[PDB]
PDB file of C-alpha atoms in Angstrom:
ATOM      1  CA  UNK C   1      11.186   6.087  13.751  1.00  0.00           C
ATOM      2  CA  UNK C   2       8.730   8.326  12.214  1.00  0.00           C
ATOM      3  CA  UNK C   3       8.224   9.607   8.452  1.00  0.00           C
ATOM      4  CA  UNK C   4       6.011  12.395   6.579  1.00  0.00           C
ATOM      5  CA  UNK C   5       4.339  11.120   3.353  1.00  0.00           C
ATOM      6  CA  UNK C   6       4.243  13.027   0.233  1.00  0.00           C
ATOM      7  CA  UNK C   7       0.415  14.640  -0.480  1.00  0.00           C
ATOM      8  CA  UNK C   8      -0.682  11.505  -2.442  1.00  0.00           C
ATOM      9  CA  UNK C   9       0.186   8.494   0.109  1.00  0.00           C
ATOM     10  CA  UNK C  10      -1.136  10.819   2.969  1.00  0.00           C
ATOM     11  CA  UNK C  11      -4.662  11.484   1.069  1.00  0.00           C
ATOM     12  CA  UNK C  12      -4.285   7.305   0.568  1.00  0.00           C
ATOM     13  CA  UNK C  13      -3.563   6.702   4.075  1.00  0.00           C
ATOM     14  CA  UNK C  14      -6.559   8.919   5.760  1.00  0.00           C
ATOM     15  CA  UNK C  15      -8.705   6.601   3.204  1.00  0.00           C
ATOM     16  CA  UNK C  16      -8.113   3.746   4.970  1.00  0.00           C
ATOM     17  CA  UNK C  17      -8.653   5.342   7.976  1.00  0.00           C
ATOM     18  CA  UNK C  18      -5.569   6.876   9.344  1.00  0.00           C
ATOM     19  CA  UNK C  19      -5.154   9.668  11.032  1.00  0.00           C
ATOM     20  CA  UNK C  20      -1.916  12.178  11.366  1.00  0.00           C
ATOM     21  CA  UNK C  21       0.991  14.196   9.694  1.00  0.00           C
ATOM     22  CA  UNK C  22       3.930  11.385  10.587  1.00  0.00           C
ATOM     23  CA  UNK C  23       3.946   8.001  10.070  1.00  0.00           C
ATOM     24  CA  UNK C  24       5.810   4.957  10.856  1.00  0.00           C
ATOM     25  CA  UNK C  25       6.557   2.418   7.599  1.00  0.00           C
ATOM     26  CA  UNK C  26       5.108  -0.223  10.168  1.00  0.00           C
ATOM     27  CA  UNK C  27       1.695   1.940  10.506  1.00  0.00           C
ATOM     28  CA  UNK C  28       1.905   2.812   6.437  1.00  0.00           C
ATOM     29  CA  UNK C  29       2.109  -1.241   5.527  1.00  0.00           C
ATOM     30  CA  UNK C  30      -0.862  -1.747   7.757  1.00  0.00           C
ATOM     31  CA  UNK C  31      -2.949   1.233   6.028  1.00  0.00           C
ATOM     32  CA  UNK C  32      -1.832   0.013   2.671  1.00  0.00           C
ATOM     33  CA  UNK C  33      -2.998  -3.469   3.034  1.00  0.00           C
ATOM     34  CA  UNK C  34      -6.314  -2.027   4.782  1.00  0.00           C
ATOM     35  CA  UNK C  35      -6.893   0.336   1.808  1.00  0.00           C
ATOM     36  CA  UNK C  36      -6.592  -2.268  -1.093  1.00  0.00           C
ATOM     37  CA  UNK C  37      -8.801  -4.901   1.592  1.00  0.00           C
ATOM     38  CA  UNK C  38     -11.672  -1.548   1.358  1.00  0.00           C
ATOM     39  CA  UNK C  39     -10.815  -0.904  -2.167  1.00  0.00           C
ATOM     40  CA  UNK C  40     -11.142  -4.501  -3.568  1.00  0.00           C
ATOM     41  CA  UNK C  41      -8.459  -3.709  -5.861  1.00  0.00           C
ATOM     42  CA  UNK C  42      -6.648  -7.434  -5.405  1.00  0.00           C
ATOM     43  CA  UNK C  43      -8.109 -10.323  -8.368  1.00  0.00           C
ATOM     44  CA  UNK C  44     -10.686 -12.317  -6.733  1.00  0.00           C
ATOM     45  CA  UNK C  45      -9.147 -15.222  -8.136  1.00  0.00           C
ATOM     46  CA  UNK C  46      -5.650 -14.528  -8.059  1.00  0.00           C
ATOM     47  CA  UNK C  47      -5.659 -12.181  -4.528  1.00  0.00           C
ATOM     48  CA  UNK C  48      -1.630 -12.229  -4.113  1.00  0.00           C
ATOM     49  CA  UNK C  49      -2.354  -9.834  -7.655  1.00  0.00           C
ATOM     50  CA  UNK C  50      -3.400  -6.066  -7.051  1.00  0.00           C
ATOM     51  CA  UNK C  51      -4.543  -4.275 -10.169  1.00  0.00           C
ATOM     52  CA  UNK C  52      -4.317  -0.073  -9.170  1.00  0.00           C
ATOM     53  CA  UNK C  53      -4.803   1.139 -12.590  1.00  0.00           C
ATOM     54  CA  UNK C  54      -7.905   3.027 -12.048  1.00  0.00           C
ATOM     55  CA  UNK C  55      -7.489   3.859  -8.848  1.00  0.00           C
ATOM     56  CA  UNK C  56      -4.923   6.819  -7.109  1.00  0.00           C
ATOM     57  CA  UNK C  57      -2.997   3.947  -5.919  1.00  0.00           C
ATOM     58  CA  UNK C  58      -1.939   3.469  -9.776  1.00  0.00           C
ATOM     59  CA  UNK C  59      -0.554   6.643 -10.149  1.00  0.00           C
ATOM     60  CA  UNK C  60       1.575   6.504  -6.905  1.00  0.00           C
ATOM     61  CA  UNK C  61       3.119   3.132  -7.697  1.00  0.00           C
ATOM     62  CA  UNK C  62       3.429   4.091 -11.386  1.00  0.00           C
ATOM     63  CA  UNK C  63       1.561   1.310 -12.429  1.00  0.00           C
ATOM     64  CA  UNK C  64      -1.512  -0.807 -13.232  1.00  0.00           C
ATOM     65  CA  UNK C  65      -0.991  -3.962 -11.598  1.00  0.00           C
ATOM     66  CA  UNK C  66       1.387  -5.587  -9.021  1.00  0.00           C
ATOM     67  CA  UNK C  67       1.869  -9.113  -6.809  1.00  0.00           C
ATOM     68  CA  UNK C  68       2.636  -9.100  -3.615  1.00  0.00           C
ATOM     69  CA  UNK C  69       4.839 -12.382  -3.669  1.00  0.00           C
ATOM     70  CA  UNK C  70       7.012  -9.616  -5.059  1.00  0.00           C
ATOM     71  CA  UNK C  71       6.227  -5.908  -3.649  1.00  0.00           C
ATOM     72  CA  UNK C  72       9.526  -4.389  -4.723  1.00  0.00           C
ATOM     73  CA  UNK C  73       7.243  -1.497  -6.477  1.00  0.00           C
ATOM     74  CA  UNK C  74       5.931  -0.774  -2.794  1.00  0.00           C
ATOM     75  CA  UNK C  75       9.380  -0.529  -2.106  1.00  0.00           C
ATOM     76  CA  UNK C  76      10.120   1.579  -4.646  1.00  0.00           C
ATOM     77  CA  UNK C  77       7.244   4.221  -3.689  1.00  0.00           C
ATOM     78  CA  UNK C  78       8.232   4.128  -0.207  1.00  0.00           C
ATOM     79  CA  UNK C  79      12.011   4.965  -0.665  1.00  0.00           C
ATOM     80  CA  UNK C  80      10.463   7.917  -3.117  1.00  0.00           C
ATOM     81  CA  UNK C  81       7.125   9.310  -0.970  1.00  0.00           C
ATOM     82  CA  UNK C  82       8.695   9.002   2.618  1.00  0.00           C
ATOM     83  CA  UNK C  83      10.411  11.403   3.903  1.00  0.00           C
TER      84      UNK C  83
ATOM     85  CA  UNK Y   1      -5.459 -18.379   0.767  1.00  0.00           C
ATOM     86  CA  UNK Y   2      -6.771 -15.038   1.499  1.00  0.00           C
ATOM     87  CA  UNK Y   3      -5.351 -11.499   0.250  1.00  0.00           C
ATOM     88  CA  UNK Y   4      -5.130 -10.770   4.161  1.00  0.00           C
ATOM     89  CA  UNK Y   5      -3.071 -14.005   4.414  1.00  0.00           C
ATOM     90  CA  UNK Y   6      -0.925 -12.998   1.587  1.00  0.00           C
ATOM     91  CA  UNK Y   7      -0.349  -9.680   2.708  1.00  0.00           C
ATOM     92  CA  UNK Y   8       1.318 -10.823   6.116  1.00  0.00           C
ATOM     93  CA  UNK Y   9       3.261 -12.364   4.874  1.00  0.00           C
ATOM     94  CA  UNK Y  10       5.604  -9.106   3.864  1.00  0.00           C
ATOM     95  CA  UNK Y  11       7.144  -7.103   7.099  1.00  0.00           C
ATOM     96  CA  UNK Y  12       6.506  -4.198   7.922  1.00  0.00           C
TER      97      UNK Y  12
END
């Protein structure tokens, strides 16, 4: 079942690469982990950690950093930027 | 363990 994004995820998603108006959370997980893989934003060291601070990602999470042994601030974002 | 490895292992 299909969902619009919110300005900021959409500008986010076409700079991973995807294309569209509606979106699928399936298809937004994939374009998410392909835009932080592009990015670099994940430790070298420690990948499971993201650090977003300084990036638009940040700003959409409301963050700096995050794990994704525990991604409920992706779940957060996604309840709030998905319509 | 990869970040590509990590990140499968959430669904989607």
């Amino acid at each position: 079942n299909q969902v619009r994004p919110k300005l900021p995820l959409l500008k986010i998603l076409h700079a991973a690469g995807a294309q569209g108006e509606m979106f699928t959370v399936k298809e937004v997980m994939h374009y998410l982990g392909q835009y932080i893989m592009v990015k670099q934003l994940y430790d070298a060291a420690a990948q499971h950690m993201v650090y977003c601070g300084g990036d638009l990602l940040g700003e959409l999470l409301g963050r700096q950093s995050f794990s994704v042994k525990d991604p409920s601030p992706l779940y957060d974002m996604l309840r709030k930027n998905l319509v | 363990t990869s970040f590509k490895e990590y990140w499968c292992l959430l669904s989607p």
